[PDB]
Amino acid sequence: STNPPPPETSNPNKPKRQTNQLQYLLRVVLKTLWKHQFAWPFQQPVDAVKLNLPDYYKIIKTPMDMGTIKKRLENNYYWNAQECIQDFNTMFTNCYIYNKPGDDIVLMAEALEKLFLQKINELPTEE
Numbered sequence: 001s002t003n004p005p006p007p008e009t010s011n012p013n014k015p016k017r018q019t020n021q022l023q024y025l026l027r028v029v030l031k032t033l034w035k036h037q038f039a040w041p042f043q044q045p046v047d048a049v050k051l052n053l054p055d056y057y058k059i060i061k062t063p064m065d066m067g068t069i070k071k072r073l074e075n076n077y078y079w080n081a082q083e084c085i086q087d088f089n090t091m092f093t094n095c096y097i098y099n100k101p102g103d104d105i106v107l108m109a110e111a112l113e114k115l116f117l118q119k120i121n122e123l124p125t126e127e
């Protein structure tokens with residue numbers, strides 16, 4: 001039983017920019033969420049082998065995690081903030097698909113998502 005290869009965190013043939021929104025997304029949004037007591041399960045790809053979740057990557061075909069997003073930000077992988085926000089959304093959606101309402105992992109995701117939305121409600125001037 002193996003995990004899949006993780007998502008790419010660089011790609012020279014994908015357009016990219018440094019923008020004020022993307023800088024904020026790393027410096028403020030990601031960095032703040034990272035320090036939350038409920039960040040830890042979302043700080044790396046799901047290790048389905050270690051966690052003994054053999055069906056995880058049968059159900060979840062578009063993995064995404066904050067460790068990946070951090071790397072993407074640091075490497076200027078994104079063209080715009082919206083692309084990074086989409087990744088965060090995929091992370092949350094995955095968690096809500098694989099688990100169920102009331103699970104502890106879902107309480108963790110819901111708290112992170114609430115905080116995320118608060119942080120992103122106001123960004124720097126778009127570019």
Ligand SMILES: Cc1noc2c1-c1ccccc1C(c1ccc(Cl)cc1)=N[C@H]2CC(N)=O
Pocket residue numbers: 040041042046051053095098099104105
């Ligand atoms: C992300 C993600 N989505 O699902 C899971 C994770 C996850 C990642 C790393 C460590 C643990 C997990 C947890 C989990 C469960 C309880 C608590 Cl308190 C904390 C985390 N759950 C699995 C699914 C599972 N059913 O085990």
